[PDB]
Amino acid sequence: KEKNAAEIRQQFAMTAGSPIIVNDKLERYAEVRTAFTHPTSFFKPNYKGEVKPWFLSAYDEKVRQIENGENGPKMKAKNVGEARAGRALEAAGWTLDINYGNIYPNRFFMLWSGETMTNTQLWAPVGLDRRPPDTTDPVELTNYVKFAARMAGADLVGVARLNRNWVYSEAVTIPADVPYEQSLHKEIEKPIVFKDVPLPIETDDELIIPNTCENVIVAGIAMNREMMQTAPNSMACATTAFCYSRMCMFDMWLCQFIRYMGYYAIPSCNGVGQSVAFAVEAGLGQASRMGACITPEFGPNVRLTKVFTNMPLVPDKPIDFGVTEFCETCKKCARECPSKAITEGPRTFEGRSIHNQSGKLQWQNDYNKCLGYWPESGGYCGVCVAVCPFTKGNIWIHDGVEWLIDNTRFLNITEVWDGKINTYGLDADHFRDTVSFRKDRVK
Amino acid sequence: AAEIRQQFAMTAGSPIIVNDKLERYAEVRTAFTHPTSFFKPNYKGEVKPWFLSAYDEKVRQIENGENGPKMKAKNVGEARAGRALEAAGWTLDINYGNIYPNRFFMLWSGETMTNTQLWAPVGLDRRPPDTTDPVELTNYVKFAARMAGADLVGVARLNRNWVYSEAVTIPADVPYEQSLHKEIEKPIVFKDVPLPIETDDELIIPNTCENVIVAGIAMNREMMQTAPNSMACATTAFCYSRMCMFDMWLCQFIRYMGYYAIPSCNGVGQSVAFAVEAGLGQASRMGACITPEFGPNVRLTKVFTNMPLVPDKPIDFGVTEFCETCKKCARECPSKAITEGPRTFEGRSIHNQSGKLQWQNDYNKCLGYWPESGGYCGVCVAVCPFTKNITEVWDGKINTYGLDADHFRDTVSFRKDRV
Ligand SMILES: Oc1cccc(Cl)c1
Ligand SMILES: Oc1cccc(Cl)c1
Ligand code: SF4
Ligand code: SF4
Ligand code: SF4
Ligand code: SF4
């Protein structure tokens, strides 16, 4: 029986309700607490023992590997030119991303209003962003916005009501008068608040999201399997990087579509809130031991971005295809993790360190240990994603009655450069899995 | 598809036939820019820049619940959604085509880009190349081109006949808000200099700029078949933003490999000629490059570089002989812009470059239909055999970037077909 991704999603659909289990110690999480930004984790030694911002120490390791003809830690390249080429591809992939994630809200690409954008100015005579909505029916709007999402580069798209528990209490950002070249030295915190205002607006003191901001649209941006399977080496860094620029394009495209439909839209990429939780509530997939959203189509080998809006929409149903029970017995990511960051224990409500948000039931991982491996390896690792059985393209089988996971699944870089590739790194052997008709956009 | 393209490869040599009269063509002569064609009436009889008159028709259509000229939408909501999708598609494109060289997204150096600055401590853009072998470089850069969103990619030596003699641009310190009102003409010249450079007087391409890399960016078939209505405008628009990201991504890769790279999108030179010389397809009666995978339903962009590369062979799969007897685009064109006659070396008007054997079309007649219809037409692309209602499009099949899984296998690539 030929694989039917739509059938699979329908088979495992849940009844409505946020799947994330929480208790009374839950409070919104200040973004500065992530390992990338917090002072306790931001600094890492380089290979000479010099203590630096982690990404500068990682740069030192990239340079060292190129000079030594390596594609990764102790991984010899074919020659220096191949080592150089992998890092050139990685660096280029980030072209449309600011400071590794686009996290500053309402700066650079992540503007909360389209008014100053060159595209908005060019189109101003038509008045699409000033004319009241011609469609308020959530059913039709869901079909329109999901169609637009696929045009804008999403491989998966889902809708959820906005759960404010996953919106950061304070964002990391920069003052509005700070030019890019000083941005990394002038980062500040700024509260994200919800108020009775008509439009998203930023004051000197606050980023203000309107109380009318009902919905979040979550996109999955598929990474390339062959390149991620080289983790922790450079080609895994390149598929990561290119997908961050795809995320940025998605956010801007979709926000402009929503604005030109007469609503407002807030982009975010890696900023504003916790993408994994939104993705789980929007039904893209389930949380996992490693901490990523695992999808039926791509496993965890998929990036996430999201857009917040007042556009009326129909929320999607969460999905339960057994990930929690497989993660309970699998632990491959924990065993293979080069830094032992991933727990082999049970889920708890108690954060392992400052980097975890306490009060939600999850596997609690040590993300300072994870980040510490990045300067050592000169990359963004990804070994957990690479070894997860759900990342394999071969997991789904049909037994004549229904779909199921094949339990047998759970028991070099020159060839990548010389091997299979297609547009955006997508794989035509599986691309049919993300075909979409109206019936699977809105019910 | 790899079998087909090898089967139809020609021996080396530009297939475009030229004569002694050929001269490089000033970009201002295109119908989009030239003063004789730029102003068009709207439906009220008011003469405006053609795209503003076209805007007025889009507004009139939304108000009247239409997706195109005399084409009722399901309701006003559907009409609005089609124009919202079209407008959004252009997000990463400046003034319909990114033609101003070394402005906005089309910078000729990576030095000021936020990504280059972030990566500066690694020194990839200042380190000499570690690879000079054109075979390996061709494989690397084509792999990168596919990562960067090209559905097709080819390489040719740069033929300066197709580089505009003078570009349309704006002064470097003019802000976006005044760009449309302060467009100027600036020569593109070739000189013995190390790097692409712009002076007050000239855009200077180095004599070492040996090669052009041409990308095909596939449009969506269902949407283009709604031409001249709004969903054909939307697939057009989204692919212009795909073009811009391709140029920037690939230029950065080439720079981080130790070479220089000039992006262009619709600027700098004539994409159809470059695409034919790079083997993506053949010229056609309508004037487009027709590819085996997509026919003419594919957009083009290109990047110029001194990176050593292996030129691809031109391809001949019989387009010329088919266009000789077909004439379907010419009979369906709503403005009679496309000739039914034979190819000549003599342009029909200022908008054509004389001195090259081609079907000569009247591109002022084409542009005149755009304000009338409120869109970018595309009927010629839609009806062409090589290419093979709006509610059904919105309710129907779609996939990532509008690509089609029924055909996506045709653009799979291994090293054997890259070099
Ligand atoms: O969020 C990410 C992911 C990978 C690399 C970096 Cl630097 C940031
Ligand atoms: O080059 C193009 C193509 C379509 C529309 C416009 Cl305005 C320009
Ligand atoms: S490797 Fe195993 S335990 Fe880890 S996330 Fe994947 S399925 Fe779960
Ligand atoms: S990215 Fe690497 S170091 Fe981090 S959790 Fe995954 S396997 Fe461990
Ligand atoms: S775009 Fe339309 S008007 Fe222009 S040549 Fe093609 S069919 Fe004719
Ligand atoms: S419609 Fe016919 S004559 Fe026109 S470009 Fe296509 S094949 Fe050629």
Side-chain angles (χ1 to χ4, degrees), chain A residues 180-206:
Chain A
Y180 172 76
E181 55 269 10
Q182 296 186 328
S183 54
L184 285 171
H185 329 96
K186 306 245 170 315
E187 289 177 346
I188 62 168
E189 293 184 83
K190 193 166 204 176
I192 299 172
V193 306
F194 292 84
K195 299 221 205 143
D196 285 317
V197 298
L199 292 172
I201 186 175
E202 181 179 13
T203 70
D204 286 345
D205 302 318
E206 298 179 313

mmCIF file of all heavy atoms in Angstrom, chain A residues 180-206:
data_model
loop_
_atom_site.group_PDB
_atom_site.id
_atom_site.type_symbol
_atom_site.label_atom_id
_atom_site.label_comp_id
_atom_site.label_asym_id
_atom_site.label_seq_id
_atom_site.Cartn_x
_atom_site.Cartn_y
_atom_site.Cartn_z
ATOM 1 N N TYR A 180 23.455 47.572 13.088
ATOM 2 C CA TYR A 180 23.750 46.143 13.138
ATOM 3 C C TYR A 180 25.136 45.857 13.709
ATOM 4 O O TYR A 180 25.304 44.919 14.496
ATOM 5 C CB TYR A 180 23.626 45.501 11.752
ATOM 6 C CG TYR A 180 24.121 44.088 11.838
ATOM 7 C CD1 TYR A 180 23.333 43.104 12.417
ATOM 8 C CD2 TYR A 180 25.410 43.752 11.436
ATOM 9 C CE1 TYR A 180 23.798 41.815 12.541
ATOM 10 C CE2 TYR A 180 25.883 42.475 11.566
ATOM 11 C CZ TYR A 180 25.075 41.509 12.119
ATOM 12 O OH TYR A 180 25.549 40.238 12.258
ATOM 13 N N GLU A 181 26.152 46.631 13.312
ATOM 14 C CA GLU A 181 27.518 46.281 13.703
ATOM 15 C C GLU A 181 27.743 46.351 15.213
ATOM 16 O O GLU A 181 28.683 45.724 15.713
ATOM 17 C CB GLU A 181 28.532 47.167 12.974
ATOM 18 C CG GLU A 181 28.326 48.654 13.131
ATOM 19 C CD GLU A 181 27.453 49.251 12.047
ATOM 20 O OE1 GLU A 181 26.841 48.487 11.266
ATOM 21 O OE2 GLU A 181 27.395 50.500 11.966
ATOM 22 N N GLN A 182 26.896 47.064 15.955
ATOM 23 C CA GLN A 182 26.979 47.073 17.412
ATOM 24 C C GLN A 182 25.989 46.126 18.086
ATOM 25 O O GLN A 182 25.988 46.036 19.319
ATOM 26 C CB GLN A 182 26.754 48.487 17.942
ATOM 27 C CG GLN A 182 27.821 49.485 17.529
ATOM 28 C CD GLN A 182 27.621 50.831 18.189
ATOM 29 O OE1 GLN A 182 26.490 51.240 18.459
ATOM 30 N NE2 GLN A 182 28.721 51.526 18.465
ATOM 31 N N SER A 183 25.158 45.417 17.312
ATOM 32 C CA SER A 183 24.023 44.701 17.894
ATOM 33 C C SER A 183 24.458 43.686 18.945
ATOM 34 O O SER A 183 23.837 43.584 20.010
ATOM 35 C CB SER A 183 23.218 44.013 16.790
ATOM 36 O OG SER A 183 24.058 43.196 15.998
ATOM 37 N N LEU A 184 25.518 42.921 18.671
ATOM 38 C CA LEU A 184 25.895 41.856 19.594
ATOM 39 C C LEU A 184 26.427 42.389 20.919
ATOM 40 O O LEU A 184 26.457 41.642 21.899
ATOM 41 C CB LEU A 184 26.925 40.931 18.941
ATOM 42 C CG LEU A 184 26.396 39.964 17.871
ATOM 43 C CD1 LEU A 184 27.546 39.267 17.136
ATOM 44 C CD2 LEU A 184 25.446 38.929 18.470
ATOM 45 N N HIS A 185 26.839 43.653 20.975
ATOM 46 C CA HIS A 185 27.342 44.243 22.205
ATOM 47 C C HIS A 185 26.290 45.045 22.960
ATOM 48 O O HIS A 185 26.547 45.450 24.096
ATOM 49 C CB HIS A 185 28.551 45.151 21.910
ATOM 50 C CG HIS A 185 29.369 44.707 20.740
ATOM 51 N ND1 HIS A 185 29.203 45.227 19.476
ATOM 52 C CD2 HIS A 185 30.346 43.777 20.634
ATOM 53 C CE1 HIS A 185 30.048 44.643 18.642
ATOM 54 N NE2 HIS A 185 30.754 43.757 19.319
ATOM 55 N N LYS A 186 25.119 45.274 22.370
ATOM 56 C CA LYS A 186 24.105 46.142 22.961
ATOM 57 C C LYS A 186 22.780 45.421 23.205
ATOM 58 O O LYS A 186 21.728 46.069 23.281
ATOM 59 C CB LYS A 186 23.878 47.365 22.076
ATOM 60 C CG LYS A 186 25.152 48.131 21.768
ATOM 61 C CD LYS A 186 25.128 49.518 22.376
ATOM 62 C CE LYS A 186 26.502 50.169 22.270
ATOM 63 N NZ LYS A 186 27.584 49.213 22.659
ATOM 64 N N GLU A 187 22.799 44.101 23.339
ATOM 65 C CA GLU A 187 21.553 43.377 23.547
ATOM 66 C C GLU A 187 20.964 43.706 24.913
ATOM 67 O O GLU A 187 21.692 43.901 25.888
ATOM 68 C CB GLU A 187 21.785 41.880 23.396
ATOM 69 C CG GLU A 187 22.059 41.480 21.939
ATOM 70 C CD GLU A 187 22.363 40.005 21.782
ATOM 71 O OE1 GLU A 187 22.623 39.341 22.807
ATOM 72 O OE2 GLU A 187 22.345 39.507 20.637
ATOM 73 N N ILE A 188 19.633 43.795 24.963
ATOM 74 C CA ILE A 188 18.877 44.137 26.162
ATOM 75 C C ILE A 188 17.713 43.161 26.294
ATOM 76 O O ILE A 188 17.411 42.394 25.383
ATOM 77 C CB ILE A 188 18.347 45.585 26.121
ATOM 78 C CG1 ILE A 188 17.375 45.762 24.946
ATOM 79 C CG2 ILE A 188 19.495 46.590 26.012
ATOM 80 C CD1 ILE A 188 16.584 47.064 24.990
ATOM 81 N N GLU A 189 17.050 43.202 27.445
ATOM 82 C CA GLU A 189 15.787 42.496 27.616
ATOM 83 C C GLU A 189 14.636 43.487 27.523
ATOM 84 O O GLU A 189 14.760 44.648 27.919
ATOM 85 C CB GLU A 189 15.696 41.783 28.962
ATOM 86 C CG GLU A 189 16.635 40.620 29.194
ATOM 87 C CD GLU A 189 16.346 39.959 30.529
ATOM 88 O OE1 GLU A 189 15.419 39.116 30.603
ATOM 89 O OE2 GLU A 189 17.001 40.340 31.528
ATOM 90 N N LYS A 190 13.497 43.008 27.031
ATOM 91 C CA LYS A 190 12.320 43.861 26.925
ATOM 92 C C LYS A 190 11.061 43.026 27.128
ATOM 93 O O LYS A 190 10.899 42.001 26.440
ATOM 94 C CB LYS A 190 12.289 44.547 25.562
ATOM 95 C CG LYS A 190 11.304 45.679 25.437
ATOM 96 C CD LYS A 190 11.608 46.480 24.181
ATOM 97 C CE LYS A 190 11.094 47.869 24.288
ATOM 98 N NZ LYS A 190 11.481 48.696 23.104
ATOM 99 N N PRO A 191 10.160 43.425 28.028
ATOM 100 C CA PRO A 191 8.975 42.603 28.295
ATOM 101 C C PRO A 191 8.074 42.481 27.073
ATOM 102 O O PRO A 191 7.941 43.413 26.280
ATOM 103 C CB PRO A 191 8.268 43.359 29.428
ATOM 104 C CG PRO A 191 9.339 44.205 30.056
ATOM 105 C CD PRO A 191 10.220 44.604 28.912
ATOM 106 N N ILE A 192 7.451 41.311 26.939
ATOM 107 C CA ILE A 192 6.372 41.082 25.984
ATOM 108 C C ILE A 192 5.071 41.050 26.765
ATOM 109 O O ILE A 192 4.868 40.172 27.613
ATOM 110 C CB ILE A 192 6.570 39.774 25.204
ATOM 111 C CG1 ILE A 192 7.870 39.814 24.397
ATOM 112 C CG2 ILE A 192 5.351 39.523 24.310
ATOM 113 C CD1 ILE A 192 8.244 38.481 23.734
ATOM 114 N N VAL A 193 4.179 42.000 26.482
ATOM 115 C CA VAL A 193 2.953 42.133 27.251
ATOM 116 C C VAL A 193 1.759 42.092 26.305
ATOM 117 O O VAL A 193 1.875 42.339 25.103
ATOM 118 C CB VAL A 193 2.943 43.426 28.106
ATOM 119 C CG1 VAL A 193 4.200 43.497 28.990
ATOM 120 C CG2 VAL A 193 2.858 44.650 27.217
ATOM 121 N N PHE A 194 0.598 41.767 26.873
ATOM 122 C CA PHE A 194 -0.664 41.704 26.143
ATOM 123 C C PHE A 194 -1.592 42.795 26.664
ATOM 124 O O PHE A 194 -1.845 42.876 27.870
ATOM 125 C CB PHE A 194 -1.308 40.324 26.288
ATOM 126 C CG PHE A 194 -0.537 39.228 25.608
ATOM 127 C CD1 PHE A 194 0.529 38.606 26.246
ATOM 128 C CD2 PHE A 194 -0.872 38.822 24.325
ATOM 129 C CE1 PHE A 194 1.250 37.602 25.620
ATOM 130 C CE2 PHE A 194 -0.146 37.809 23.688
ATOM 131 C CZ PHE A 194 0.910 37.202 24.338
ATOM 132 N N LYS A 195 -2.086 43.640 25.764
ATOM 133 C CA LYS A 195 -2.895 44.782 26.164
ATOM 134 C C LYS A 195 -4.017 45.005 25.163
ATOM 135 O O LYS A 195 -4.023 44.445 24.059
ATOM 136 C CB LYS A 195 -2.042 46.047 26.310
ATOM 137 C CG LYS A 195 -0.959 45.911 27.369
ATOM 138 C CD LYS A 195 -0.827 47.163 28.191
ATOM 139 C CE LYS A 195 0.554 47.280 28.793
ATOM 140 N NZ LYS A 195 0.990 48.700 28.789
ATOM 141 N N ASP A 196 -4.986 45.828 25.575
ATOM 142 C CA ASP A 196 -6.139 46.160 24.737
ATOM 143 C C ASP A 196 -5.747 47.310 23.814
ATOM 144 O O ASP A 196 -6.055 48.479 24.047
ATOM 145 C CB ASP A 196 -7.352 46.503 25.596
ATOM 146 C CG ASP A 196 -7.987 45.267 26.227
ATOM 147 O OD1 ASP A 196 -8.133 44.239 25.529
ATOM 148 O OD2 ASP A 196 -8.334 45.317 27.430
ATOM 149 N N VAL A 197 -5.040 46.955 22.746
ATOM 150 C CA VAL A 197 -4.645 47.896 21.699
ATOM 151 C C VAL A 197 -5.052 47.289 20.364
ATOM 152 O O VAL A 197 -5.237 46.067 20.261
ATOM 153 C CB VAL A 197 -3.126 48.190 21.742
ATOM 154 C CG1 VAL A 197 -2.749 48.836 23.068
ATOM 155 C CG2 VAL A 197 -2.336 46.892 21.525
ATOM 156 N N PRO A 198 -5.229 48.118 19.317
ATOM 157 C CA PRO A 198 -5.698 47.568 18.034
ATOM 158 C C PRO A 198 -4.637 46.804 17.253
ATOM 159 O O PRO A 198 -4.971 45.864 16.521
ATOM 160 C CB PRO A 198 -6.157 48.811 17.259
ATOM 161 C CG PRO A 198 -5.380 49.942 17.851
ATOM 162 C CD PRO A 198 -5.208 49.596 19.315
ATOM 163 N N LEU A 199 -3.370 47.189 17.384
ATOM 164 C CA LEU A 199 -2.317 46.650 16.532
ATOM 165 C C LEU A 199 -1.078 46.348 17.360
ATOM 166 O O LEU A 199 -0.831 47.016 18.370
ATOM 167 C CB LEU A 199 -1.942 47.634 15.410
ATOM 168 C CG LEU A 199 -2.940 47.925 14.289
ATOM 169 C CD1 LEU A 199 -2.431 49.068 13.416
ATOM 170 C CD2 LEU A 199 -3.167 46.681 13.449
ATOM 171 N N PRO A 200 -0.270 45.366 16.948
ATOM 172 C CA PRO A 200 1.024 45.162 17.611
ATOM 173 C C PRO A 200 1.839 46.446 17.567
ATOM 174 O O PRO A 200 1.903 47.125 16.542
ATOM 175 C CB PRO A 200 1.685 44.048 16.784
ATOM 176 C CG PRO A 200 0.571 43.393 16.046
ATOM 177 C CD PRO A 200 -0.443 44.476 15.789
ATOM 178 N N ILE A 201 2.448 46.792 18.694
ATOM 179 C CA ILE A 201 3.161 48.059 18.788
ATOM 180 C C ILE A 201 4.280 47.905 19.809
ATOM 181 O O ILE A 201 4.149 47.169 20.789
ATOM 182 C CB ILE A 201 2.188 49.209 19.146
ATOM 183 C CG1 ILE A 201 2.891 50.565 19.107
ATOM 184 C CG2 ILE A 201 1.548 48.980 20.506
ATOM 185 C CD1 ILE A 201 1.950 51.742 19.330
ATOM 186 N N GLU A 202 5.394 48.579 19.560
ATOM 187 C CA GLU A 202 6.522 48.574 20.474
ATOM 188 C C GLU A 202 6.714 49.979 21.020
ATOM 189 O O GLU A 202 6.802 50.933 20.248
ATOM 190 C CB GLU A 202 7.800 48.103 19.778
ATOM 191 C CG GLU A 202 8.995 48.056 20.707
ATOM 192 C CD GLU A 202 10.253 47.561 20.032
ATOM 193 O OE1 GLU A 202 10.278 47.474 18.786
ATOM 194 O OE2 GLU A 202 11.224 47.253 20.757
ATOM 195 N N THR A 203 6.771 50.102 22.344
ATOM 196 C CA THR A 203 7.111 51.364 22.981
ATOM 197 C C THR A 203 8.554 51.298 23.452
ATOM 198 O O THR A 203 9.247 50.295 23.261
ATOM 199 C CB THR A 203 6.185 51.657 24.155
ATOM 200 O OG1 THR A 203 6.477 50.742 25.221
ATOM 201 C CG2 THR A 203 4.717 51.526 23.732
ATOM 202 N N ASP A 204 9.012 52.382 24.089
ATOM 203 C CA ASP A 204 10.349 52.371 24.674
ATOM 204 C C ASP A 204 10.489 51.280 25.726
ATOM 205 O O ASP A 204 11.582 50.738 25.910
ATOM 206 C CB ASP A 204 10.677 53.733 25.302
ATOM 207 C CG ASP A 204 10.964 54.804 24.270
ATOM 208 O OD1 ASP A 204 11.186 54.460 23.091
ATOM 209 O OD2 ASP A 204 10.971 55.997 24.647
ATOM 210 N N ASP A 205 9.402 50.943 26.420
ATOM 211 C CA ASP A 205 9.466 50.028 27.553
ATOM 212 C C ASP A 205 8.990 48.616 27.243
ATOM 213 O O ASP A 205 9.413 47.682 27.930
ATOM 214 C CB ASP A 205 8.628 50.562 28.720
ATOM 215 C CG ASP A 205 9.077 51.938 29.184
ATOM 216 O OD1 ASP A 205 10.301 52.179 29.268
ATOM 217 O OD2 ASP A 205 8.199 52.778 29.460
ATOM 218 N N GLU A 206 8.105 48.428 26.259
ATOM 219 C CA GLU A 206 7.391 47.165 26.112
ATOM 220 C C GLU A 206 7.157 46.808 24.650
ATOM 221 O O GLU A 206 6.902 47.681 23.815
ATOM 222 C CB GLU A 206 6.019 47.211 26.806
ATOM 223 C CG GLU A 206 6.048 47.444 28.310
ATOM 224 C CD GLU A 206 4.652 47.509 28.895
ATOM 225 O OE1 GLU A 206 3.795 48.213 28.315
ATOM 226 O OE2 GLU A 206 4.410 46.846 29.922
#
